[PDB]
Every structure is written in C-alpha cells, then in structure tokens.
Amino acid sequence: APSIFDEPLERVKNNDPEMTEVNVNNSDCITNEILVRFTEALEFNTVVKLFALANTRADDHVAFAIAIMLKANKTITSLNLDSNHITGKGILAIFRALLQNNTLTELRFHNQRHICGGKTEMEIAKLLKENTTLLKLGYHFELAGPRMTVTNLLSRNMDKQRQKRLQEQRQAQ
Ligand SMILES: [Cl-]
Ligand code: NA
Ligand code: NA
Ligand code: NA
C-alpha cells in the first residue's frame, strides 16, 4: 500500500542531492510510523538541511526517534516540531541529544497540545548550558528564570560561533 510519502521518503534514503529539505508540516495524511521512517532515513543522510514536521500529530515516540537521529546526523541545521503532541519527555530527550550534536542551530516547538511545565523548562535551561551551537530556540518559556537564562545562552552561543567563523575566515587569510 504505497502512500504519497513513498517518493520523498525514498529520496531521503537515496541521499538525493536535490532533496535538501523534508517539510511535511500540516500533513493530515501522515502517520507517526511514517514520521519515524523519515527520521530513521535521516540518520545517515548527508543532504537534508531542514526537517520540518510541524502540525503532524507527532508524539513523544517521534521525538525520541529524532533525539537518536540527532546524535548521528551532522547535516540538519533546522528542526521544526511546532504544533504537535510532544510532552516534556520528548523535548528533554532532544535536549539531551544536543549534548552530542554540534550542527543543529535552530530548534522550534511552539504550541504543543500541552505545555511542558516549569520543571521541564528548568532542565531545558540546564541542558542548554552544555551546548554552544544552538542559536535559535523557538519556544516561549512560561517561567522567567529559564526564559532569561536561555536567552543569555543563545546570545553566548551566537557570540561564540561568530568568533569561530571569524577565526576560520582569518585562518586562510
Ligand atoms: Cl533521553
Ligand atoms: Na536509511
Ligand atoms: Na550529531
Ligand atoms: Na578583525
């Protein structure tokens, strides 16, 4: 029973050099199994820069798969998880994976079905301390402490990566 996602999934699996994004945002036809299949196909894909699956009913199982994938994938720079069913458990799995990923620069997960809660926000801020490459975090923190801490950490990271880009440019100047 071939779905409409067969071709894009197989392009990812083939490392199609023209398949530079996977954007399945708003796909009413997609399933959690297909989302996991895309996620596993991305582990060793070296082309895709964006994985966007906003508003696809993605749940914690999809987020766990994504966390695993982020430990392998060195190519995706932007990940859109907005408007799904992911809980603090899924979000924290991803921030734990970001302890072992230095290439993702944008993560967003606005408007989940349920807020993640203050305890999760605190642990997000703690985990982010250890990652110096995330530059954009699309989430509005309910608690001010995590909110301002994360804002300061993203600024830290932006400053650090600008320093590293100048250094790299100067290196062969
Ligand atoms: Cl975890
Ligand atoms: Na694969
Ligand atoms: Na990685
Ligand atoms: Na200078």
Residue numbers in the entry: 314 to 486
Quoted passage from the original study:
Tropomodulins (Tmods) constitute a conserved family of four isoforms that work in conjunction with one of several tropomyosin (TM) isoforms to cap the pointed end of actin filaments in cytoskeletal structures characterized by their uniform distribution of the lengths of actin filaments. Leiomodins (Lmods) are related to Tmods, and constitute a subfamily of three isoforms: Lmod1, expressed preferentially in differentiated smooth muscle cells; and Lmod2 and Lmod3, expressed more abundantly in skeletal and cardiac muscles. Lmods are distinguished from Tmods by the presence of a C-terminal extension, featuring a proline-rich region and a WH2 domain. We show that ABS2, and not the C-terminal extension, is the main factor distinguishing Lmods and Tmods as filament nucleators and pointed-end-capping proteins, respectively.
Similar results were obtained with Lmod1, although in this case removing the N-terminal region had nearly no effect on the nucleation activity, and the isolated ABS2 had even stronger activity than that of Lmod2. The structure of Lmod1ABS2, the strongest nucleator among the naturally occurring ABS2s analysed here, was determined at 1.54 Å resolution, and shows residues Ala-314 to Gln-486. The structure superimposes well with that of Tmod1ABS2, with a root mean squared deviation (r.m.s.d.) of 0.57 Å for 131 equivalent Cα atoms. The major differences occur at the N and C termini of the domain, consistent with the lower sequence conservation observed within these areas. The C-terminal helix is rotated ∼4° compared with Tmod1ABS2. However, this difference does not necessarily correlate to function, since the C-terminal helix is generally flexible and changes conformation when bound to actin7. The differences at the N terminus appear to be more important. Indeed, the loop of Tmod1 implicated in pointed-end capping (Tyr-170 to Val-183) is missing in Lmods, and the corresponding region of Lmod1 visualized in the electron density map (Ala-314 to Phe-318) is oriented in the opposite direction to that of Tmod1ABS2 in the unbound as well as the actin-bound structures. First, in Lmod ABS2 lacks the N-terminal region that in Tmod interacts with the DNase I-binding loop at the pointed end of the second actin subunit of the filament.
